[PDB]
Amino acid sequence: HGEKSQAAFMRMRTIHWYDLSWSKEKVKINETVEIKGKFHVFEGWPETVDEPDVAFLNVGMPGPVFIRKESYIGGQLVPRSVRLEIGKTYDFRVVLKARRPGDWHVHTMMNVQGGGPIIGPGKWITVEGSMSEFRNPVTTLTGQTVDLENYNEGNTYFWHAFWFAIGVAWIGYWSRRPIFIPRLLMVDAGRADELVSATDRKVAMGFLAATILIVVMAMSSANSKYPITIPLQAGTMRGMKPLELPAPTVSVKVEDATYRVPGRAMRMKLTITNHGNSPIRLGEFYTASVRFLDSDVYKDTTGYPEDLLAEDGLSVSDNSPLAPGETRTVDVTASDAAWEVYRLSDIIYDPDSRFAGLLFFFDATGNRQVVQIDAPLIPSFM
Amino acid sequence: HGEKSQAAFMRMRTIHWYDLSWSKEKVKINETVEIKGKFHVFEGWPETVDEPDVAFLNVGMPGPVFIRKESYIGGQLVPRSVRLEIGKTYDFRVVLKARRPGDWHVHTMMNVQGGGPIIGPGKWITVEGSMSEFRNPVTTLTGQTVDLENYNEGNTYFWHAFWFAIGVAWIGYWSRRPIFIPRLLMVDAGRADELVSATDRKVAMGFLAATILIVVMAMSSANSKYPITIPLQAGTMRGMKPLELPAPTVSVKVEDATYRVPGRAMRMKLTITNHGNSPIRLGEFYTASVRFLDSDVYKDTTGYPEDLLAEDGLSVSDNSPLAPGETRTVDVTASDAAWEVYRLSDIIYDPDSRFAGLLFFFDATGNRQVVQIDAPLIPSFM
Amino acid sequence: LLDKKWLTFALAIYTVFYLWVRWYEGVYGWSAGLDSFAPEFETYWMNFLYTEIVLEIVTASILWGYLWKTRDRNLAALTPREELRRNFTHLVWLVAYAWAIYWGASYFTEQDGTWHQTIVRDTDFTPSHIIEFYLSYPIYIITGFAAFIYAKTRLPFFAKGISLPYLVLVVGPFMILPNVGLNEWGHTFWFMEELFVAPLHYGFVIFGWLALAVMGTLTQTFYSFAQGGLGQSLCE
Numbered sequence A, B: 001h002g003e004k005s006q007a008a009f010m011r012m013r014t015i016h017w018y019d020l021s022w023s024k025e026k027v028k029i030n031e032t033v034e035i036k037g038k039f040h041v042f043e044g045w046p047e048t049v050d051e052p053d054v055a056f057l058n059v060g061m062p063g064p065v066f067i068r069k070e071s072y073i074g075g076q077l078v079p080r081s082v083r084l085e086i087g088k089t090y091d092f093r094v095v096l097k098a099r100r101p102g103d104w105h106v107h108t109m110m111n112v113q114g115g116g117p118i119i120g121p122g123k124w125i126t127v128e129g130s131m132s133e134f135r136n137p138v139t140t141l142t143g144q145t146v147d148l149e150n151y152n153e154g155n156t157y158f159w160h161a162f163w164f165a166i167g168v169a170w171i172g173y174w175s176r177r178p179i180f181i182p183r184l185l186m187v188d189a190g191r192a193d194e195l196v197s198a199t200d201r202k203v204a205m206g207f208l209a210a211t212i213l214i215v216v217m218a219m220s221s222a223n224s225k226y227p228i229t230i231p232l233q234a235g236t237m238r239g240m241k242p243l244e245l246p247a248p249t250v251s252v253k254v255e256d257a258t259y260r261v262p263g264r265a266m267r268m269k270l271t272i273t274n275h276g277n278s279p280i281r282l283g284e285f286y287t288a289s290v291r292f293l294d295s296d297v298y299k300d301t302t303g304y305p306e307d308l309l310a311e312d313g314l315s316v317s318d319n320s321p322l323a324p325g326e327t328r329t330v331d332v333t334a335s336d337a338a339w340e341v342y343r344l345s346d347i348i349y350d351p352d353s354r355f356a357g358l359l360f361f362f363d364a365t366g367n368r369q370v371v372q373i374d375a376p377l378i379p380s381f382m
Numbered sequence C: 001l002l003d004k005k006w007l008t009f010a011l012a013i014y015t016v017f018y019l020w021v022r023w024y025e026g027v028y029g030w031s032a033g034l035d036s037f038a039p040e041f042e043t044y045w046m047n048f049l050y051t052e053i054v055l056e057i058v059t060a061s062i063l064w065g066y067l068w069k070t071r072d073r074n075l076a077a078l079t080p081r082e083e084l085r086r087n088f089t090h091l092v093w094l095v096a097y098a099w100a101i102y103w104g105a106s107y108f109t110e111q112d113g114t115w116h117q118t119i120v121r122d123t124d125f126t127p128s129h130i131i132e133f134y135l136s137y138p139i140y141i142i143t144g145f146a147a148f149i150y151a152k153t154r155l156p157f158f159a160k161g162i163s164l165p166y167l168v169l170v171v172g173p174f175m176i177l178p179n180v181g182l183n184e185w186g187h188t189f190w191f192m193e194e195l196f197v198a199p200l201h202y203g204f205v206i207f208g209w210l211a212l213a214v215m216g217t218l219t220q221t222f223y224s225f226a227q228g229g230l231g232q233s234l235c236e
């Protein structure tokens, strides 16, 4: 919900999310929904964005309508920030537990230590039930099961109310007598030295001693109870395992890419060389959360969001099967209302008119090749 | 001597020193002791420690009880700071010349430009003789042999004493007359204009002219003598040659690692898969300068420090030879008094409860494999 | 008469209006108010922004102009009882200014923090800012200017000169509103983060300090109160 505002070229060239899947579309309170997929870090990382040396796999949602039970980057849990390598492909997995009823647009996002949020595709997930049913039980290493929704709430309330009452008692004790104008006049006209006299000093000594003693005894009591504590666990986690993808057998060279201003279409000319030993066909072009598909080649069955999916948004001038060894040049037009709805046409406002995307080539057997393209994007007006 | 205070997790995951050796344990004055070994830079370098882009191979010792004659990282001399690559293994060598009699705990350390000192294992080396016998002869490119213990000492003393005497002469010339109260009263009561009169101005002119002339003539004389000088040689040395270690044929996956609080033992569960074509046996676990050995598999003969060596500190639930291709899960307990003496149990105080270490697998023929492990370390209290 | 029931209205108008504003933003925060490019956002929050800016300009003009036009020309011939009444009215104005300052600089500003930690920033005109930067800040600016003008035009102590502590108390908090330019510039160019303690926010901090001139202002109002109606009782 925070995208459609970021620079179109930044959205095009930061991180490409693909193979995304959502376990459920409608969940009850306390039920779990799992978000899986792969994200690829673009080689041409924009220079004003710091390299993802410190990155956090976040969830884009309107507050804790879900609680992030687990999140994985490469199979291992990542509660802290992680280091990602430019050009690598990682598979991720986020597990969410429903907490608040309603229709929530859940995004998979990545936060970078020096570049801000990289928001992936968002899917509407419906939560049904009541928030009062939500439970977050946690078992500690000391052998007690607590509910994280209300654990320590009473203690926090008690201590804050107690200290507030102490401060209010101090102020009220001094506020029983006249406060501002008589005291100002007494201080002004000659020495004051009458507005602070015993037992006011005794009361101040009592307040100071009681405050120090109460703090010390409360700390000692909170040491006896909860004798085992650990500091906050933090620190960037290195060694994120990337995916060992096979080298693509398709080489694509982009010879110019243009988009009409105004318009909802992007046109590019590609020289595709088919290596390997299978006839391939271009089936999908993904640029920035928007998937332009050729329905004659590939159909989406993973429940991708409708506003981001163009079922027939990809048109190839010659999409006949490309025999192995054969190289041909085709005109590829990616046209959908999403190009303007998500402001990919606002790249004309950007100070770097360059695009990046993913091309998916499918053979007869159905196995697919992921080839990555990037080129300058030239607007056309006349 | 400066370790046992650094965070246990930082000591566990910065740099792993192994294959260490000391040429001599007791040396006379002017005798040479050589420290060799290999250090491996951990892949999961802690984020608050800067990457060893600028590192210096230092020696941990109580001052110049030895002089560092030479130090090598990869066979070549490294008098300046060097650049190390995370994940690489380097072999080092330090040559020390005995200078001061006594029992000295000599450490091999590495200083990082943004993370401070990484102290390796320390060994007690005894120096016998007298400090008066120590010599540090150096031959210059101008053809003169000088002793670095006292070279230029007389000249330094002379020049500092001369300039101090000049300043003292100035102050004393002004201090022959009354100093503070009469002069203060003369300046206060009317114009002073009597406390500074010729030939005081002539003396000041003489002092200024003599100072400038002496500085100029001394610089000219120090230019004539020593006509050949070079600036201080400095600059980080890149291109440190790392060791080309063969890829290990043993793959170890750590399934949970726990340590009792309080306790002197660390327990972990490992799934060891033996590739290659030789039956292997786990013989050593090195975590942070502490070597837990299985005496039935491996025995130390390099004179490792006794306080850091656990001859039978490593116990494996099933340490029978692991046939090639076979994978098995074993319970490994690393127990020694060193775990508490060197405060490896203080990792509970650390904000990152993760450990790293080295496992050494030996086959029947005796050749060994170095496999590196790292995992979260979970304290156990109940 | 002296202190009359204008104080009750001064508290109640701010309380009721800001409770309604809080209800409005709790209803339209999500659901037409998350996406800044949806048509419903334009009708529920951009229209709110336009309406509130126009109404604030009109109200400021009307209030300040009326206070300046009805200014007391013959301040010399003013009875001490009427001076006491006017001092109490000025104290009511200061109470209203304090209430508005609370609502603007504490409630809606830390509420802007909730939003600036829970959702991805989409524009410079999110609901939170519209309710804070362009509603509550102008409201307390209007109240402070009105209090200053009333003091200068009715109280002889605050006439014959511009009070420095009063001017600082009135203008420094106003400087937070043009400081919004630093906030937006410091959030889009500087600091690709949502750190609430970033140096981009010290502009509010610097000009939030100038509200400490309320101490000099209040001792000045105490002296104005104790001009003729000082005693007796006090200091006797």
Ligand SMILES: CCCCCCCCCCCC(=O)OC[C@H](COP(=O)(O)OCC[N+](C)(C)C)OC(=O)CCCCCCCCCCC
Pocket (backbone or CB within 6 Å): C013, C016, C017, C020, C021, C024, C043, C044, C047, C048, C049, C051, C052, C053, C055, C056, C059, C060, C138, C139, C142
């Ligand atoms: C210092 C001088 C300050 C000047 C600025 C004042 C800003 C006022 C609010 C702007 C509203 C806007 O712009 O929006 C107009 C809204 C849009 O809502 P709607 O879609 O019609 O839904 C139905 C309306 N509900 C959602 C509010 C129920 O509708 C309206 O007509 C109603 C606006 C009522 C404002 C007056 C009540 C304030 C609380 C009572 C104590 C004073």
Ligand SMILES: CCCCCCCCCC(=O)OC[C@H](COP(=O)(O)OCC[N+](C)(C)C)OC(=O)CCCCCCCCC
Pocket (backbone or CB within 6 Å): C006, C007, C009, C010, C013, C059, C067, C070, C086, C089, C092, C093, C096, C139, C142, C143, C154
């Ligand atoms: C919707 C906006 C309604 C604002 C109404 C403003 C009322 C007019 C201001 C005003 O001049 O005085 C109102 C009251 C009573 O003071 P008055 O005595 O009426 O003021 C003049 C003094 N004089 C009679 C001796 C000449 O003085 C007060 O204390 C009134 C405080 C009102 C709170 C400020 C509201 C501002 C919201 C932007």
Ligand SMILES: CCCCCCCCCC(=O)OC[C@H](COP(=O)(O)OCC[N+](C)(C)C)OC(=O)CCCCCCCCC
Pocket (backbone or CB within 6 Å): C060, C061, C064, C065, C068, C149, C152, C162, C167, C171
């Ligand atoms: C925006 C940032 C403000 C900058 C701060 C500058 C003002 C600070 C000093 C100040 O307030 O004094 C101006 C007068 C007070 O009386 P004086 O300054 O003595 O002069 C009165 C004659 N004058 C009204 C033309 C100025 O006060 C008034 O007369 C104000 C009431 C008249 C203005 C009403 C019209 C404004 C509608 C928008």
Ligand SMILES: CCCCCC(=O)OC[C@H](COP(=O)(O)OCC[N+](C)(C)C)OC(=O)CCCCC
Pocket (backbone or CB within 6 Å): C019, C022, C023, C024, C026, C027
């Ligand atoms: C001194 C500042 C008081 C701020 C109280 C506040 O923000 O109230 C809104 C909140 C809203 O929660 P709730 O009462 O449950 O009503 C929800 C209605 N919306 C969502 C519109 C706020 O609770 C109330 O309305 C209580 C009334 C307090 C009167 C001083």
Ligand SMILES: CCCCCC(=O)OC[C@H](COP(=O)(O)OCC[N+](C)(C)C)OC(=O)CCCCC
Pocket (backbone or CB within 6 Å): A113, A114, A115, C190, C191, C192, C193, C199
């Ligand atoms: C009164 C104390 C002011 C200290 C300023 C400060 O903390 O700045 C941190 C920042 C370091 O940037 P960093 O915290 O790394 O920002 C990370 C997020 N990005 C890269 C998007 C800015 O340094 C600067 O850019 C210069 C600040 C000048 C102050 C007058």
Ligand SMILES: CCCCCCCCCC
Pocket (backbone or CB within 6 Å): A212, A216
């Ligand atoms: C001057 C007051 C110092 C208080 C020190 C208390 C130490 C208690 C140790 C648990």
Ligand SMILES: CCCCCCCCCC
Pocket (backbone or CB within 6 Å): B212, B216
């Ligand atoms: C005002 C004194 C300047 C002295 C300059 C001396 C230059 C000597 C060159 C060797």
Ligand SMILES: CCCCCCCCCC
Pocket (backbone or CB within 6 Å): none
């Ligand atoms: C990246 C280093 C930033 C240093 C900022 C220093 C601020 C000091 C303010 C006087």
Ligand SMILES: [Cu+2]
Pocket (backbone or CB within 6 Å): A001, A002, A105, A106, A107, A122
């Ligand atoms: Cu969304």
Ligand SMILES: [Cu+2]
Pocket (backbone or CB within 6 Å): A015, A016, A040, A041, A042, A043, A372
């Ligand atoms: Cu990519």
Ligand SMILES: [Cu+2]
Pocket (backbone or CB within 6 Å): B001, B002, B105, B106, B107, B122
């Ligand atoms: Cu030592």
Ligand SMILES: [Cu+2]
Pocket (backbone or CB within 6 Å): B015, B016, B040, B041, B042, B043, B372
């Ligand atoms: Cu290592």
